[PDB]
Structure 1
């Protein structure tokens, strides 16, 4: 499987741990499209940063 992740809100003024998790995801600038594996761990990542990202599911 695969996931399309795109940050929809800026990182500014967000909890430091959330910012670091965003870096882990690998989104530098707002509205970047990134493809990632559908693991439980990345699912948890998206769940945590859900208020900043939208998920489009591919495959």
Structure 2
């Protein structure tokens, strides 16, 4: 399975850890659509940064 991940808010006003988790996700500018796997790693990433991102499931 694959996930469609899109950022809804901005990077500023958020801490070093959430910013670096976002960089790991690969989301640099707002409203960016990025494709990833369904690993527990990515699940934890989305859990941590869920207030900045919106997730869609494909497949």
TM interval, shorter chain, is over 0.9
Give the 4+ runs in structure 1 shifted more than 6 A: none
TM-score by length of 2: 0.98
Q: CA deviation at 1:39?
A: 0.2
TM-score by length of 1: 0.98
Give the secondary structure class of the aligned counterpart of 1:20: helix
Q: Within 2, Cα distance between the matches of 1:19 and 1:54?
A: 16
Question: Structure 2: which 5+ residue stretches go unaligned?
Answer: none
Q: Within 1, Cα distance between the matches of 2:30 and 2:46?
A: 15
Give the secondary structure class of the aligned counterpart of 1:51: coil
Number of aligned positions between the proteins: 59
RMSD in angstroms over aligned alpha carbons? 0.4
Q: Within 2, Cα distance between the matches of 1:21 and 1:8?
A: 15
